[PDB]
Structures are given as structure tokens and as C-alpha cells.
Amino acid sequence: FRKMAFPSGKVEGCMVQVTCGTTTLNGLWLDDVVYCPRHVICTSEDMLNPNYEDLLIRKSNHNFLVQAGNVQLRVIGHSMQNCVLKLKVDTANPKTPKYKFVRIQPGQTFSVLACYNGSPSGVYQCAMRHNFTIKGSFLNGSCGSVGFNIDYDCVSFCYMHHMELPTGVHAGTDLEGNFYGPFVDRQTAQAAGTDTTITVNVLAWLYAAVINGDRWFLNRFTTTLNDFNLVAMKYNYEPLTQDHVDILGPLSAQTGIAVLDMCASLKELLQNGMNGRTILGSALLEDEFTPFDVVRQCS
Amino acid sequence: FRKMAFPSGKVEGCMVQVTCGTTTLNGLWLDDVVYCPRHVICTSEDMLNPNYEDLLIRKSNHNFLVQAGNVQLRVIGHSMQNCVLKLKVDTANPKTPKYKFVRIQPGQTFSVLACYNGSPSGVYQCAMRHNFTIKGSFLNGSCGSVGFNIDYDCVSFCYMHHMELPTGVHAGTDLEGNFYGPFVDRQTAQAAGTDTTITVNVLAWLYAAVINGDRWFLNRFTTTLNDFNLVAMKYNYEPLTQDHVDILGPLSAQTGIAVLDMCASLKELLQNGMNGRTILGSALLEDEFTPFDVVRQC
Ligand SMILES: *[C@@](O)(CO)[C@H](C[C@@H]1CCNC1=O)NC(=O)[C@H](CC(C)C)NC(=O)c1cc2c(OC)cccc2[nH]1
Ligand SMILES: *[C@@](O)(CO)[C@H](C[C@@H]1CCNC1=O)NC(=O)[C@H](CC(C)C)NC(=O)c1cc2c(OC)cccc2[nH]1
């Protein structure tokens, strides 16, 4: 079981670079709009304490350099939506895929296409942590890189990169410019909330073990969802939502193990430990495979 | 610090589906040639012990159905090079990238674009292990998926997928059709040689952990190269060469930890264990990052 990204080609064809003054980052070119982080309009000094509505009044269309490779796309309009800038360009991208903009929940995974100067560099899978950070791999010039899932050739864009925290994890927005978590696009040291283990994904991992014949941890007990949530919080595990219970439905049906029965097995694991045993070869419980990832790989 | 694959778009544009009778797998369409595993010509019966030259002479161009998304490509010629079939088509692939075929050495990494029915499905990083297997994620229908590296828009293809061993590791060929390792394209259970750990990669990864602010495994000791290799061979690690020491130079300079100091640290980890602790999130010593992988990403 390994972390697999989606093929990145459909997103590669949408990556551009956006420069204002000397400040350069990446943008996403879909139809005749380029989406990028709004702090491109800031000078290094401005980012310390920017007033974005005031910085944007000073900008005109002709202040924006949008390039696909070294080919300039002329900007014919601009607007600000939350923390993203939308630049209307005179050319509709012929490589635009079928797409949607979606806001994901904590625990969900997505592929990140890390980009520099408009040029894709690498691709890897990330999980949104419950403190709304991702454990990415980003260097200077990576802002505007995007995260996505692909469902039957439709690209659901869910992340645009803005920030590296002092702890080394990363934070960003959806494609409507709304940050995940309590972060702000200022050049300031911000701290994330305490992380928690992603319970719904640990349960997915346990189903994956069962599918593969590794089922020693299945016990004879069950639990209510409220009782489980109150115990889980004492082990720094996230409480389950109704949506979590329902996305475990397919794996529960496939194995015949009720969701709440698996919760009872996890509860026993948390209270008593692995006792030196392993699950899928590992002494650690994995929390960055979603139920979707598990079926995506298992079947 | 993450296992990071190359962007796969240049390879996606080359994946096609190849069908012979009841048998289907993936092919790689470059210019006017489709490369695919030769066992596509085998029925279930043939695959137990196939005489590939005999089976191929009995095939016609029309026996090969090649589909690129929706379009069907007319096969106008075919030849076999070792375990790889080369289907000449009457259409050149307009999306062919600048490319090369290379054969990689153990320890080197590459990106895998896992495909099913000629449609790309996922991308992830693999390393060619010392026993010439790879730890991949491949299901039924994945044969003909390829591995590659990308250097300034040139795709260097190094792997075509053929088989999953009983242990769950994977085996395949270069794009000349020569297997990595002692494996053969017959429907049999095959074991690999002993899996020595790629030492220079474990050391590169320990440097990655320091560059990302983790030092708990460092120590005040040093070791000679030979004394380290004695311990390495005892734990079935590959002996470290002076070329390996040289390749680790940049990470040592960037970090200020001499290579032999990091070897003393790895020696301690091999002798004491990790004592329940973790490095870069891993409970195990990671051996699938090369020194270049660490430099490029950091
Ligand atoms: C984008 O590339 C910027 O356009 C960049 C990406 C990060 C650089 C290193 N890795 C990354 O992911 N973003 C930034 O530099 C942002 C810019 C803001 C939103 C205006 N700033 C930070 O990520 C940032 C600032 C500070 C800081 O200050 C002082 C102190 C500590 C951490 C920190 N991160
Ligand atoms: C291909 O896709 C075939 O076109 C398939 C890929 C594997 C299936 C499951 N995961 C994979 O990576 N490859 C095979 O099925 C090959 C075909 C050979 C080369 C003709 N066979 C095996 O991988 C294989 C056969 C046997 C076996 O026999 C008996 C016993 C144990 C393991 C095993 N693997």
C-alpha cells in the first residue's frame, strides 16, 4: 500500500506564471481566467502588513504579466475574490479540462502538482489535516501550485498554495480564495491548531487490512457512535461525523464488518495497544489513506 | 520531504491499449511504433511455457487491436525485441516527447505511471532494488505501464511492467525488452535473490531528515569506511563505495556532517534499533530516495 497521485497531465496544461513587478508565482489558466494568489500584487515590503483592497486599486490590467511558458497572455480584466486574484485573459486555454472547484474536508486526500515559474516540477499525494494544514514539499516560488482530484476525467481543484508555517507544514486556500483553517496571507508567523489523528482514514486502513486477510484485531464488541467519539478524543483522535460513517459504507459492505464494529475494534486498539503485533506489516496505524484511496488501490 | 514523482503529462499522451484476442494490456506509443509486453500474443494456455518466436510468426498485423483513447491505430508491421513487442502503426503520435530509452542500475529511482486499458490511473515513485525488483502498486491489467525520469523536457524511459512475484513485489524489463533480474515472462511463481538494502539511499534520507530539522539519531562517534561496511554487510546492507561517499558530498557539505559521521549514526541505528522513535514520520529506515532525489527536492 503506497501513496499514489493522480496523473497530472490535465493540470500541467493549465499552469502559467504570473508576475507583478519583481514578484512571481504560479497561476491556473482555465477558459479565459487565470487564478492566482492575490499577494502577487505585493512588494516584499508590502507583504508584511498588506492592505489588499488599497494595493489593488493601484493596479491596472497592464501591470500583470501572465505567461504560458515565455508566451505572454494579455490581461483584459482583474478582480479579487477573497485571497485569490482572477485575471481575465484574451485567450481561452485550449487545454482546459472538464473541471469543478470543490472545498474539501479534513482527512480527504488530493494530489499536489508542485510548480515553479509556471513549470511543473513534481506530483505527490497530500492529506488535509484536521488542523487544516498539509504536509507538503514546497520551496520558494511554489505559491499558486494547486491540489486536485480527478474523477472520470473531471478535475476537481481543491487547493491553491500560499504559505509555509514555522513548523514546516503548509497552508492555502480553495479556488475561491478561502483559506483552509485560521490562516491569513500576511508575512507573519502563524501557528496551527493541535493536530488529531484522522479517525475515518484509520478505519479505512483497518478495512484494508481485513480485505487482505489481516484481521487479528477484530473483536466481539460493538459501540455507539457517541460512545466511540468520546473515547477517541481522549487519544487525540478526531470524532466521526455522519459523513464519515457513510463514506465507510462501501468497505463495510465489502468486508461485512459493520462500521460501529470496526470502531469497537479500533477502541480496543487505542486502549490496549498493538501488543507488539503489526497491521499490514506496520506497527503504526496509517491515517492518510481515505476509504476512496483504499478501494482505488485494493480493487 | 515527500516521495515525489515527475509530472506525468508527457507520458500520459503516449499510453494506448493493445489487444490480441482475449488478452489486453498497455502499450507505449512513440512516433509510429507501439511498444508493449510480448506476452500479449499468448492465450492463457500459451503463457505457461510460451515459444515466443513460434507464437509470433503465426500472428498477422490484423490480429493486433491498438486503441488510443477512442481512435483505432492500424498496425502495419511488427517485430519483437527480447520481451518487448514493437507494433508499427500507420499514424505517428503527435504528442511524442523528446525521449530516450535507458537501463537503470539498482538504487536509482523512477516515476511509474500505472495504467489500465491504456488509461493512466496513478503516478508514484519506485526504486530499482538490489535484487532487481520494485515495490510497486500494480493490479490485473497493469502490464505495459512504464517507468521514467524527466530531465529538461526529455523523458528517459527505463521500465515496462510485466509481473508481480508471489511476495507482492514487481518485475519488468527495460524498453529494449531485457528483464531486470533473473525473471522470465512465463506464468510461474518466481523468487528473487536476497534483498540487500540500498545503503547510500538510507544515508541520503538521513541527510534529508537533518535538512528538515531532525537530528535525534546523530552521535559523537565516527567510523572508518571498512568498519562501517563490515556492520552493513552483517545487516544485509550494500557496501558503501568511495563513489557513494563522493555522491553524498553535496548533502554532507550542505549539512556539515561528514559522510563517515552519518555512517556511524546509521551503524548505531542498525545496532540499537530506532527504540520506538520515528524519522521523517517513518518507523523504518527508508531506502528509496537517491542523493539526487534529496538534493532536487530540498
Ligand atoms: C509563495 O511562494 C509565495 O508567493 C511562498 C511559499 C512558501 C515559501 C517556502 N515554502 C512555501 O510554501 N509563500 C510565502 O513566502 C508566504 C507569503 C505570504 C502569504 C505573504 N509567507 C510565508 O509562507 C511565511 C512568512 C513567514 C514568516 O514571516 C516573518 C515567519 C515564519 C514563517 C513564515 N512563512
Ligand atoms: C499483466 O498485466 C499481464 O498482462 C500482469 C500484471 C500483474 C497482475 C497482478 N499484478 C501485476 O503486476 N502480469 C502477469 O499476470 C504475469 C504474466 C506473465 C509475465 C506472462 N504473471 C505474473 O505476474 C505471475 C504469474 C504467477 C504465478 O504463476 C503460476 C504464480 C505466482 C505469482 C505469479 N505472478
Residue numbers in the entry:
A (entry chain A): 3 to 301
B (entry chain B): 3 to 300
Q: Could you pull the original sentences from the published paper?
A:
We then used the co-crystallization method to determine the crystal structures of several M pro mutants of SARS-CoV-2 in complex with PF-00835231. The resolutions for these structures are 1.79 Å (M pro G15S with PF-00835231)A, 1.68 Å (M pro K90R with PF-00835231), 1.65 Å (M pro M49I with PF-00835231), 1.72 Å (M pro P132H with PF-00835231), 1.64 Å (M pro S46F with PF-00835231), 1.66 Å (M pro V186F with PF-00835231) and 1.91 Å (M pro Y54C with PF-00835231), respectively. In each of these seven complex structures, each SARS-CoV-2 M pro mutant molecule appears as a dimer form, which is also the form with enzymatic activity. The details of the interaction between M pro P132H and PF-00835231 show that PF-00835231 interacts with several residues, including His41, Phe140, Cys145, His163, His164, Glu166, and Gln189. PF-00835231 was not found to interact with Phe140 in M pro G15S or M pro P132H and was not found to interact with Thr190 in M pro mutants. In fact, the G15S, K90R, and P132H mutations are located far from the PF-00835231 binding pocket. The results clearly showed that the ligand binding patterns are not disrupted by these mutations. The IC 50 value of PF-00835231 against SARS-CoV-2 M pro was 0.0086 μM, while the IC 50 value of PF-00835231 against SARS-CoV-2 M pro mutants, including K90R, M49I, G15S, V186F, P132H and Y54C, ranged from 1.2 to 3.7 μM.
